[PDB]
UniProtKB/Swiss-Prot annotation, chain A:
Species, as recorded: Saccharomyces cerevisiae (strain ATCC 204508 / S288c)
Key word Transport present: no
Cellular component GO terms, alphabetical: cytosol; nucleus; proteasome complex; proteasome core complex, beta-subunit complex; proteasome storage granule
Protein name: Proteasome subunit beta type-7
First-listed, main subcellular location of the protein, grouped into a coarse class: cytoplasm
From Swiss-Prot, chain B:
Protein name (database record): Probable proteasome subunit alpha type-7
Other comments on record: Present with 12000 molecules/cell in log phase SD medium.
Portion of the parent chain present: 4 to 126 of 288
Intracellular or extracellular location(s): Cytoplasm; Nucleus
Mod. after translation: The alpha and beta forms are probably products of the same gene with different post-translational modifications.
Record's subunit section: The 26S proteasome consists of a 20S proteasome core and two 19S regulatory subunits. The 20S proteasome core is composed of 28 subunits that are arranged in four stacked rings, resulting in a barrel-shaped structure. The two end rings are each formed by seven alpha subunits, and the two central rings are each formed by seven beta subunits. The catalytic chamber with the active sites is on the inside of the barrel.
Protein family (similarity comment): Belongs to the peptidase T1A family.
Function of the molecule: The proteasome degrades poly-ubiquitinated proteins in the cytoplasm and in the nucleus. It is essential for the regulated turnover of proteins and for the removal of misfolded proteins. The proteasome is a multicatalytic proteinase complex that is characterized by its ability to cleave peptides with Arg, Phe, Tyr, Leu, and Glu adjacent to the leaving group at neutral or slightly basic pH. It has an ATP-dependent proteolytic activity.
Length: 232, 123
């Protein structure tokens, strides 16, 4: 059958003019117990593509196995496949897609949602989504899970359509993603203060910034509230 | 006595030698020369790659193919057949890496390919 057991939280993301930002937090909850802390869900693949995975921890580990084999596979034969036929983001995507569909048909699904975040060799941005139903789509703002209706609204207020990707710079995007982790962190009851962040640029390569904390929280207001309504 | 001992290879000639397998050594002699220096640090492979004519493209063809991410395999003799032995260990190593989650040892690999090349002398 397969149904979720141990589950992550959310991986959230948006496009900007010269690359894409994607960030995810470090959590494996086993329902009520938040049992694995410091187990990372962003997986850098290639050298320009970060593939951020939500849902099952079990399943996710076994799809990291296949990505690593895929770098080994593309390297074989050809020495020019690490220079101009490298693993593109659209490549890493296509294989992840196709695997989901085929597993859906036998009625034992690999229960994950993936964002495949990168930039092409042509310099185009690539942020594309797949889930366990097998559904694909691209958007300028993308988010897995709970974050697809929590974090996604805030992110999507910076980039609304495909003509505000040029106008959104690396510093406004940086801010928006920070902000959306904090918005999640308040109202989502499976979250962790630690989160990993990747920034994909089209001139400075992939930078993998680990082990950020969320700060600048609000709680200062909470001394004022007393009772539920009858008590004052 | 009898006639043959070279029509099949799961015969054994009376001396205690084989055939075909004894003849297959002459086949490897027709190949090019290829060396390996085992260094303290690693290994360094090198291969003579003939250029027949200027019709061919230089530095675009190879007799050094990678197996796993940390093993050179470089071969001489009949080149498609040598590429089939390289092909075989790419399969073998990927299974081992799936199964036991570590880069496949060189001594493990040495056993594995050895059994296969032995295996074709038994049918």
């Amino acid at each position: 059958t397969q149904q979720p057991i141990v589950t992550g939280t959310s991986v959230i993301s948006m496009k900007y003019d010269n690359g894409v930002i994607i960030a995810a937090d470090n959590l494996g909850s086993y329902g009520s117990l938040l049992r694995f802390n410091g187990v990372e869900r962003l997986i850098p693949v290639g050298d320009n593509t970060v593939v951020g995975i939500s849902g099952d921890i079990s399943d996710m580990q076994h799809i990291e196995r296949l990505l690593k084999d895929l770098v080994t596979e593309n390297a074989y034969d050809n020495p020019l496949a690490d220079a101009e036929e490298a693993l593109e983001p659209s490549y890493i995507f296509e294989y992840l897609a196709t695997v989901m569909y085929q597993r859906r048909s036998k009625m034992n699904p690999l229960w994950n949602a993936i964002i495949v975040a990168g930039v092409q060799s042509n310099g185009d941005q690539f942020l594309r989504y797949v889930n366990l139903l097998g559904v694909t789509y691209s958007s300028p703002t993308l988010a897995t899970g709970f974050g697809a209706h929590m974090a996604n609204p805030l992110l999507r207020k910076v980039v609304d359509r495909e003509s505000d990707i040029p106008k959104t710079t690396v510093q406004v995007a940086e801010e928006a993603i920070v902000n959306a982790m904090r918005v999640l962190y308040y109202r989502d009851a499976r979250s962790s203060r630690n989160f990993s962040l990747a920034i994909i640029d089209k001139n400075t390569g992939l930078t993998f910034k680990k082990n950020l904390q969320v700060e600048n929280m609000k709680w200062d207001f909470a001394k004022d509230i007393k009772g539920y309504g009858t008590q004052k | 006595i009898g006639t043959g001992y070279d029509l099949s290879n799961s015969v054994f000639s009376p001396d205690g030698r084989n055939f075909q397998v004894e003849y297959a050594v002459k086949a490897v002699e027709n190949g090019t020369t290829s060396i390996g220096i085992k260094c303290n640090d690693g290994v360094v492979f090198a291969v003579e790659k003939l250029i027949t004519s200027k019709l061919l493209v230089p530095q675009k063809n190879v007799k050094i193919q990678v197996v796993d991410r940390h093993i050179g395999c470089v071969y001489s003799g009949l080149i498609p057949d040598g590429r089939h032995l390289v092909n075989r260990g790419r399969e073998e190593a990927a299974s081992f890496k799936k199964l036991y989650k570590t880069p496949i040892p060189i001594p493990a690999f040495a056993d594995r390919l050895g059994q296969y090349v032995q295996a074709h002398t038994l049918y």
